[PDB]
Every structure is written in C-alpha cells, then in structure tokens.
Amino acid sequence: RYPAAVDVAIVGSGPTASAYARILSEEAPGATIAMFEVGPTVSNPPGAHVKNIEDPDSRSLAQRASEGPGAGERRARPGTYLLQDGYAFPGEDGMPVAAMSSNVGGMAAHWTAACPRPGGKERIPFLPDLEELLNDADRLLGVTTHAFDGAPFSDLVRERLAAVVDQGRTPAFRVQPMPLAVHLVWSGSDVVMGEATRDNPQFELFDESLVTRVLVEDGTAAGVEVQDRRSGDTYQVAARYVVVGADALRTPQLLWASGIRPDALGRYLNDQAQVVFASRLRDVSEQSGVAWVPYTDEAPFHGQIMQLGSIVGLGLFCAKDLQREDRVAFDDDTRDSYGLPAMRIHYRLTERDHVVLDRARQEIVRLGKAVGEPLDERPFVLPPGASLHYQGTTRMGETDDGESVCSPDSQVWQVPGLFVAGNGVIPTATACNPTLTSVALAVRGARKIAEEITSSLL
Numbered sequence: 001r002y003p004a005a006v007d008v009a010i011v012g013s014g015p016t017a018s019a020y021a022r023i024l025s026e027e028a029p030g031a032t033i034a035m036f037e038v039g040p041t042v043s044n045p046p047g048a049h050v051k052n053i054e055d056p057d058s059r060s061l062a063q064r065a066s067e068g069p070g071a072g073e074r075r076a077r078p079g080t081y082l083l084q085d086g087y088a089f090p091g092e093d094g095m096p097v098a099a100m101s102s103n104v105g106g107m108a109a110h111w112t113a114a115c116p117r118p119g120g121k122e123r124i125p126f127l128p129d130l131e132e133l134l135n136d137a138d139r140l141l142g143v144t145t146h147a148f149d150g151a152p153f154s155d156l157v158r159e160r161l162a163a164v165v166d167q168g169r170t171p172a173f174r175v176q177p178m179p180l181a182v183h184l185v186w187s188g189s190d191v192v193m194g195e196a197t198r199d200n201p202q203f204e205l206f207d208e209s210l211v212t213r214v215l216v217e218d219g220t221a222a223g224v225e226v227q228d229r230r231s232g233d234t235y236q237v238a239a240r241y242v243v244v245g246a247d248a249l250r251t252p253q254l255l256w257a258s259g260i261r262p263d264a265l266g267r268y269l270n271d272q273a274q275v276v277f278a279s280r281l282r283d284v285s286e287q288s289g290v291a292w293v294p295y296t297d298e299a300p301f302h303g304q305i306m307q308l309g310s311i312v313g314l315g316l317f318c319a320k321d322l323q324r325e326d327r328v329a330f331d332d333d334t335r336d337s338y339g340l341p342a343m344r345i346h347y348r349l350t351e352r353d354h355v356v357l358d359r360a361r362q363e364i365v366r367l368g369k370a371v372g373e374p375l376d377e378r379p380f381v382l383p384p385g386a387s388l389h390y391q392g393t394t395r396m397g398e399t400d401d402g403e404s405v406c407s408p409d410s411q412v413w414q415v416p417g418l419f420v421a422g423n424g425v426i427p428t429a430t431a432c433n434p435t436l437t438s439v440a441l442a443v444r445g446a447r448k449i450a451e452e453i454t455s456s457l458l
C-alpha cells in the first residue's frame with residue numbers, strides 16, 4: 001500500500017505537519033513525501049473543517065470518527081477523546097480533560113481558528129526571524145482580522161473592553177479583533193497544505209496508517225515503521241527526513257517508543273489554565289466576531305471574547321510557571337488502545353500558578369462587567385487539559401542543554417534528520433493560542449529541509 005522509500009516522511013496530518021508538506025511542496029517540488037495519519041479521512045478536501053459539512057448528520061459522524069478509541073465534569077468535545085487512565089495522580093492535579101484527535105487534519109479539523117501573536121515573554125528569544133515566520137503562518141492558515149467587519153456587535157464589544165484595557169498599553173497589546181483562520185467558513189489542515197500540496201505529484205497522504213516507530217540507522221533518521229490499519233500489516237518506509245507532528249502528547253510517545261529517550265522529552269509540559277465567564281450586552285454566524293485582549297508580562301492571561309448575539313463568552317488563558325515535574329511519562333510495560341507505551345501525566349499547579357489563576361478570575365469578571373451584564377455570578381475554572389494547548393513536550397532550544405529536545409529548526413538533537421512539529425515545540429510560558437506559533441515554527445523547519453534537499457547532491 002505504501003512506497004518503499006521517500007525523501008520525507010511526515011507523521012501526522014495536523015496543521016503543523018501539513019505546514020511541512022506545504023513549504024516542502026512549494027519550495028522543494030521534486031522531493032517525494034509520504035504523510036501518514038492514523039485516523040480516517042473525515043472531510044473533503046482531506047483535513048477540511050467539520051463545521052463546513054452542511055448536513056448535521058454527516059457532521060456528527062465526521063466527528064465521532066475522529067474520537068479514535070473513545071468511539072463508544074470529565075468529558076471531551078466532539079472530534080476529541082480523553083485518556084483511559086494516568087491523567088490524574090495522588091498529590092498532583094493532572095490533565096483529566098486532556099484530549100486528542102485521530103483523523104486527517106488533526107484538531108485543525110475541529111478548532112476555532114483563533115490565531116493571536118505572542119507578546120512579551122511569550123515570543124521565543126532565540127528566533128530573530130519570528131515575525132517573518134509568524135506572517136508565513138498567517139498565509140498558510142488564511143488568517144484574517146476583518147472577518148466580522150459588518151458584524152453589528154463586534155465593534156461595540158471591542159469598544160467597551162478597550163475602555164477598561166487600553167490604558168497605558170501600546171497598540172499591539174490593546175483590544176482588537178482576534179486574528180482568525182476563517183476561510184462563514186473555517187480553516188483546517190485542508191487550507192494549510194492547500195493546492196500546492198494537493199496538486200503536488202510527489203506528495204501522498206495515507207490515512208489509516210499508524211506510525212509505531214521512527215527508524216534510525218547510524219544515529220540518523222532512517223525512516224518510519226507504518227502499520228496499515230486496514231490490513232493490520234506492518235511496513236517500513238525509508239527516508240532521509242522524518243517529521244513527527246502528532247501533537248504534544250503522542251509525539252513524545254512515538255519517540256519514546258522509538259528509543260529516542262532524551263531526559264528532556266515529555267518534560268516541562270505546560271497547559272494554559274482556562275477561565276470561562278459570560279456577560280449580556282446592553283442594547284437591542286456573523287454577529288459579534290471575536291475580541292482579543294492581548295497578553296502582557298504583567299498580566300499573563302490571554303483574553304477571548306466571542307459571539308458564542310447579545311450574549312458574549314469570555315475565556316482567559318494563563319501562561320504557566322514551567323517546571324520539570326510537569327511531564328508526560330511513558331510505561332513500556334503497559335500499552336494503549338493503539339499499542340504504544342501507555343502515557344501518564346505528571347501535572348501540578350505551583351503556588352505561582354494559583355496566584356495567576358485567581359488573578360484570571362478577578363480580571364475576567366472585570367472584563368465581564370465592562371462589556372455589560374454578567375450572567376453567572378462566579379467565573380468557572382476549567383480542569384487542566386481543557387485548553388487543548390499543550391506546550392513543551394518536545395520544547396525547542398538554542399543549544400543542547402538537557403532541557404531542550406530539538407533545535408531552533410525543530411531538529412531533534414541526538415537524531416539528525418528527525419524533526420518535531422506541533423505545540424510541544426514551544427519552550428516559553430505562553431497564554432495565547434499556540435497553533436499560529438506552531439505553524440510558524442513548522443515553517444522554519446520545513447524550509448530548513450527544503451534548503452538541504454535542494455542543495456545536496458543526492
């Protein structure tokens with residue numbers, strides 16, 4: 001079913017992995033590419049967003065097909081599934097609501113498209129071209145800030161918030177329309193790989209293909225072992241490069257099972273603590289758009305105010321005090337529904353995490369009162385894992401120091417040719433939506449590969 005060898009093997013079909021296919025497809029048009037996705041194809045084109053399926057019955061089945069092994073408070077959103085066990089532990093908080101997606105497009109086939117920029121200490125210092133890669137991350141995702149201009153309440157919502165937020169802040173950190181990847185139509189991975197990949201003769205996308213191991217020969221990326229999930233037979237596909245973009249949890253799971261077990265892999269896992277709140281405007285689906293209250297080092301929260309349109313939703317996301325004991329561990333002795341080392345989350349909020357969390361509750365209420373009439377009296381704190389923004393599992397670093405898993409170009413240290421993509425590549429304590437940053441990092445690695453493929457003599 002699969003070829004024998006390719007120039008580049010891509011594990012996963014999320015937005016970051018499809019960015020590698022994108023830049024490679026349009027920058028290295030000659031190389032051969034094999035993208036292997038465990039989950040099925042649930043949209044058209046592959047990776048399209050489910051919200052774009054008109055029929056609400058075709059959309060539900062498209063969602064349950066993405067819930068992987070969970071195809072049968074603590075529950076997951078449609079298109080996602082939770083862990084069987086090992087999420088919470090005694091003496092720790094854990095991520096009871098940490099979810100995943102198994103389908104062509106990844107979670108990019110279910111997200112809400114928010115794509116803000118990092119500010120202050122969110123931005124990655126050792127990247128002097130971050131602003132350039134960020135704009136390319138805009139291009140690939142089809143980001144737009146003017147998706148809700150005619151919207152009647154988007155302007156009023158932004159006005160009331162600015163009166164309570166804009167004091168003393170520079171223009172980049174004032175209230176503004178959230179940059180959205182809205183392609184009335186949502187952007188998935190279908191928009192990232194796009195036509196360049198979809199019309200690339202040397203690119204092939206294999207759903208129902210489980211990558212159970214990254215092959216390495218001579219200490220260098222040698223390929224991948226792919227298990228055809230429709231025949232149960234295990235193949236082996238060679239390649240000069242291997243891109244692993246299977247999300248911040250399963251990516252370290254694949255490397256750990258592959259023998260690539262650096263002491264840093266899976267550690268410094270950080271989740272954005274989410275705080276929900278609602279308010280009712282005072283007056284008389286394009287109706288309100290999305291409002292962005294940027295992050296700042298002095299208020300390490302990220303603010304989303306969306307049209308759910310008199311009633312608006314308020315969510316605040318917290319950057320975390322990164323620690324080593326925040327780690328995704330793996331047990332060889334116990335497999336999971338896919339047959340890989342069962343994972344286990346060691347996650348605990350430090351006192352600094354709570355000092356910020358309760359600050360988010362005080363501030364989201366201030367924002368709720370600024371916009372109008374608060375519904376509930378008290379803001380509700382979502383359990384760890386709800387944000388679905390897991391960073392640091394394969395964090396990036398400027399040099400090798402036992403706490404970075406890859407290089408600034410996403411190239412895993414002890415395994416040349418193996419690149420990692422996704423939220424886990426982020427190393428800094430962030431509060432905004434990472435996907436735009438994850439695509440920016442993925443674009444930097446992809447065009448590092450295209451640089452080497454087209455400049456080599458092989």
Ligand SMILES: Cc1cc2nc3c(=O)[nH]c(=O)nc-3n(C[C@H](O)[C@H](O)[C@H](O)COP(=O)(O)OP(=O)(O)OC[C@H]3O[C@@H](n4cnc5c(N)ncnc54)[C@H](O)[C@@H]3O)c2cc1C
Binds near residue numbers: 011037102106211246
């Ligand atoms: C409801 C919802 C709303 C969201 N809203 C936002 C938002 O507004 N802004 C934002 O920034 N983010 C948002 N997110 C999160 C966003 O989707 C992720 O940040 C992003 O999709 C990460 O992309 P990725 O490619 O790194 O990983 P993913 O998109 O998760 O891709 C991982 C893929 O790899 C596959 N895979 C895993 N292991 C293997 C294997 N061994 N072999 C083969 N394939 C494998 C999986 O099946 C999956 O398809 C939202 C998520 C949800 C669920």
Ligand SMILES: OC[C@H]1O[C@H](O)[C@H](O)[C@@H](O)[C@@H]1O
Binds near residue numbers: 112114274386387388
């Ligand atoms: O509950 C819906 C929410 O789900 C997730 O937490 C997303 O981060 C947010 O964008 C979305 O509105």
